Structures are given as C-alpha cells and as structure tokens.
Design a protein around this nucleic acid. Structure first.
Lengths: 100, 100, 99, 100
DNA sequence: AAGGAACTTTACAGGGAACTTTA
DNA sequence: TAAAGTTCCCTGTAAAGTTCCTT
DNA sequence: AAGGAACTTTACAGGGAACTTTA
DNA sequence: TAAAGTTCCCTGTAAAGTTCCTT
C-alpha cells in the first residue's frame, strides 16, 4: 500500500549507484541507464514487495521507460546494443527533493 | 516528507468534485478539467505543503498536464478557449486503486 | 424490472471482495477471479432476482467470461487448476464510472 | 446515470424497425444491421441524452459492434458494401426478456 | 459434469542487423 | 558524419491460460 | 497570467478494391 | 467454389486540442 517505500527505494538505488560511479546517462541527460541484473539484485533486499511488484508499480506510475511487455528497453553505448532499466531523471529529481 | 498525502489529496479532490457534480471531461474521457481557482482554494486547506508545492510535485510526477513553467493548460469547450488544471484520469484511477 | 440493480450489484460485489482481499487478478489485470460459492452466496441476499437469473444477465451482457454450459470458467493459480467466476475489469470500470 | 433509459431505447428501436420490416440480419443471425441515418434520427426523439451520448454508451457496453474510432462498421449485402450500425442480438434478447 | 493431464500462449528475459535521429 | 536512439526481425522460459480426455 | 488568433489533430463520417473466412 | 465478412488503401469535416505571439 505505502507509496513512500517505492519512491524512497528509487531515490536510494540511484544515489547508491551514483556514488559507486555505476550509472550512465542518456545523450540529453533526461534518463539514467542501469543494468537490469544490478537493479533486480538491489530490489531483492527490502521485502515490502517482490522485485517484479516494485518494477510493475514503477512502470505504471511511469518512473521508468519500458518497451512493450517488458521492464527494460534497448539502448546503445559505444556502438554496442544492450538492455537497460531506464529511469526518468525528472521522476528521480522531485522524489529526491521530497525526501531532502 | 510523505508522498501519500499528495496522492490521497489528488483522489480526494476528484472524489469531492465528482459528488458536487463539478467535473468536465476531455473528448476521450482520459482527462479531467478543473478550474484553476477552485483547485488552488481546495489545496489551501491541508497544510502539509503549499498549493504551489503540491502542484509542482503533481506536474513532475505527471499526474497533471501543464504548459512549460505553469500548472495551468489551455483547453477548448464549445468553441471557446480557457485555462484549466488538467488531471490525467489514468493517474487518478491508478492511485484510487493503490489505496482501495 | 431494473438493469441498475444488476449493474450496482456487480460493482458492490467487486468493491466488497476488494476491501476484504478475497479477489485475485489475471496476469494482464484485465480480469477478476472470484470463488463460485462466495459469489453465489452474496447474490442470494438482494431478492430482485434469483442467483441464476443474475448470472444469466451478467453472462449475456458479457460482464463475466463463462465456459459452455456454466456460469464459471477454468483458471490456474500457482500451477493449480480450479473454477472461478471471471469478471471483466472493463465492465466493472465502466459500470463503476456510471455512478 | 439511469441505464434503463439506454437499454429500453435499444429494445424499442429494434422492436420499431422489426415491425416496419427495416431490419436485416447477419448470416449467423447473431447481429442486426440498421442504417446509420435511420438510427441517429430515431435517437433524436428521447431527450435524456444526445445521439452521440447514447451511441458512446452502447459502444462502451459492447451492445453494438463498431470499427476503431467509429459508431458503425462495414457490412456486405448481395455483394454491395455499406456502413451499418450493428446491434448484438444477444444484447437485444436479454434487455427484451428483462422488460417483458 | 468434473477435474486430472496436456497442450498453447504470454509476459517477462535475451540478441543480430539495419535503419532513423540527434549533437 | 558518427554515435545514440530506435525498429524490425528473430529465440528462450515458466507459469498462466486453455483444451483434451476420462470419469 | 490572460487572451486573441490561427494552426494541427482527432474521432466521427464516407468508399473502391482486394483480401480472408465461412456455408 | 462464391458471397459474407473484413481489411487495406485512401478522402472529408468540425470542433477539440495546441501553439504563436502580444499585452
């Protein structure tokens, strides 16, 4: 039920990977690319909901950009294609402001 | 500090105006048009944040459709132009569901 | 002699079981699974029509998805097969929005 | 609001055109084809809602079969194509049984 | 008719290859 | 003017969704 | 912010021709 | 089959939806 749990996690995940210089930005800096496995591992810790439950809510509330039927989208870094979990910077920025 | 207060207010504002029959809908029924002065009066009551503070978070989380650096939007009803605060019905339904 | 009695009952039944957490959703969240016995017990209360009379109208107006000669369809929850009364979320939504 | 007004109209319209022999059936007899103009003229009479308001509700509740972004669909009678308002016979049949 | 068993689809996971868009 | 961003093709998988088949 | 004016889109309306499905 | 049923091409329109631009 409690929405802060999901919002706090999104901010915490981005803050953690930002410190551990483990996050990449889109060309326009409007999006954050995170590895699907890293994010799914970090979401396993807090047992308020399942990893898929957290990603469904993030997708539905449009805090992450997904492809049809998936929790991630195709990206290109240094001419190589891969899948990444794409977090909207705009969604991270207020949620962070709210808890700052 | 509590994201639920903002989400509960959005649902409560829509529920209040729905009972008092004061809602206008978009052609596709995907959006709710509310008078700017009305929402700004209703948002004055609960003192967890300022009216502008509440509208900034609603805009940033994309629960309302606005024009760049405004909380308002231009609409058209019976050939006449006016400004309304435009609430996404999808955002209202997702949030009402998440609390009941 | 009133379609609203059937319509309002569908919304009321879904609202009741949603609060009491006795509702399960399909994978795509397009359908609501309800136990055949629970729904048949709840439909006994309001005497405007019989339980089978209410389920016939719900089926015919396609507010519920049914198998051939029944008012329930086969479902699967955690690899186990069973029969449930399957309510279209679409129907529930539109009807809820009417009132 | 009063759903009976919409249901009673659907049954009344089909009953009227059935007597005046202005009804055509699908091959499987599961659908009723009515001329778009005739039905829109008949829906003008009872002022509880607009013609477009009545057809939106009929479409939503799936009492009529429509094409994407329309209140009618393409049909074929004796090798000739035309557009008709297609009423589900199943929808007409309970709505009629309820009110007899 | 009722339900155990078995077949089909889906919603998540992935990639090669080539196209379109942007700084 | 080249790399990001996207789009069109596919594959893999476990459980949901559905149908077969027996009683 | 407010509002005149003018642009673009959408959800309704139509049809010829050709494709897919059914008796 | 051969006609029903459907889809793929297109066009037209008025008002909603949006943007431009000035105050």
């Amino acid at each position: 039920k409690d929405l802060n749990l999901y919002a706090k996690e999104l901010v915490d995940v981005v803050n953690y990977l930002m410190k551990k210089n483990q996050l990449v930005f889109s060309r326009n800096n409007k999006f954050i690319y995170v590895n699907t496995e890293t994010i799914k591992s970090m979401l396993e810790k807090r047992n308020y909901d399942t990893v898929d439950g957290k990603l469904y809510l993030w997708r539905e509330l449009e805090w992450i950009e997904c492809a049809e039927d998936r929790f991630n989208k195709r990206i290109k870094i240094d001419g190589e294609n891969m899948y990444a979990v794409v977090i909207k910077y705009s969604s991270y920025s207020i949620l962070k402001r709210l808890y700052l």
